[PDB]
């Protein structure tokens, strides 16, 4: 289940950085950025393999 | 390690999800507020 709908202004400013890099296809800060997300727990609606992709939102001080 | 925050994209117009807890829960992102 998806837990409602959160304003972009209520998220960390680093989330806006991630959205800007998704639009330009990078360059990305982490190796795992752009890989397929499997959705193996069915939290999101079921879709084909390759429908969903994952990207890091940086946490300041976490390298 | 890089912390627990991520965005997942789907294929549809503005279909983006935020997680703060390494995929345990998700919310749809409203880019208009």
UniProtKB/Swiss-Prot annotation, chain A:
Keywords: Disulfide bond, Endonuclease, Hydrolase, Lyase, Nuclease, Secreted. Its EC number is 4.6.1.24. It catalyses: [RNA] containing guanosine + H2O = an [RNA fragment]-3'-guanosine-3'-phosphate + a 5'-hydroxy-ribonucleotide-3'-[RNA fragment]. GO terms for cellular component: extracellular region. It comes from Kitasatospora aureofaciens. This is Guanyl-specific ribonuclease Sa. GO terms for molecular function: lyase activity; ribonuclease T1 activity; RNA binding; RNA endonuclease activity. It comes from the Bacteria. It is found in: Secreted. The chain holds residues 1 to 63 of 96 of the full protein.
